[PDB]
Design a protein around this ligand. Structure first.
Ligand code: NDP
Ligand code: 65J
Length: 186
């Protein structure tokens, strides 16, 4: 199994969701970028795995589920099986990651992408090890009911460039946003 990564899009006041949807109106290229980053392997004959909490899964439009060309794994202690359309179910982040080391998954999985929500991000961010955060900065405040955890810039370095990620500002529907990559290794 390769890289462990988080990917998120966040507002200026650290917002990631509101009422089970994004705080902002849909941004076409942000969706494209999320799709491109989580799908693209760098290891022939392998697939990336996406790990998300239950609320995150159900927040994706049913038509868009499962995230195609990726192995879809949902985190939940209440569910007894994977949701309709999902591939795997685990009862914790550790278990999910433990699960990648099984004869089954071990040789099929390139990158692992945590795609939210807050609690999943928090646990990954605070766990020792090599981790990147792919952060889309939505450059306004938006009304939100769930937030991205604190990024500790003592451990997470903002990268000055990263291949296949743009460095300038984008804008859709009057909303400016930028892509960022942070790395820690501890
Ligand atoms: O953590 P969750 O997925 O839900 P949260 O934090 O409320 O997120 C949903 C909101 O945020 C948006 N969003 C999601 C990802 C990225 C993103 C962005 N802008 O990039 C935005 C969505 O649109 C929503 O508005 O789910 C909570 C349930 O999942 C289970 N959970 C989380 N973590 C674990 C876990 N189960 C087991 N282990 C772990 N580590 C829990 O399920 P339960 O209650 O046990 O059945 C949580 O309830
Ligand atoms: C495209 C919006 N979006 C989303 S919601 C979404 C995800 C995939 C498909 C989809 O179809 C409308 C919606 C998530 C979970 C997500 C994420 N973790 N990181 C970034 N940078 N963007 C994200």
């Amino acid at each position: 199994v390769g890289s462990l990564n988080c990917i998120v899009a966040v507002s200026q006041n650290m917002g990631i969701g509101k009422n089970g949807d994004l705080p902002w109106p849909p941004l076409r290229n942000e969706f494209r970028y999320f799709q491109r980053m989580t799908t693209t392997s760098s290891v022939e004959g392998k697939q990336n795995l996406v790990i998300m909490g239950k609320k995150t899964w159900f927040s994706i439009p049913e038509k868009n589920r499962p995230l195609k060309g990726r192995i879809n794994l949902v985190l939940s202690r209440e569910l007894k099986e994977p949701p309709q359309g999902a591939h795997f179910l685990s009862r914790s982040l550790d278990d999910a990651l433990k699960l990648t080391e099984q004869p089954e998954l071990a040789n099929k999985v390139d990158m692992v992408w945590i795609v939210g929500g807050s609690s999943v991000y928090k646990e990954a961010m605070n766990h020792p090890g090599h981790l990147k955060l792919f952060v889309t900065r939505i450059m306004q405040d938006f009304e939100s009911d769930t937030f991205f955890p604190e990024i500790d810039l003592e451990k997470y370095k903002l990268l000055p460039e990263y291949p296949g990620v743009l460095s300038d500002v984008q804008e859709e529907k009057g909303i400016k946003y930028k892509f960022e990559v942070y790395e820690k290794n501890d």
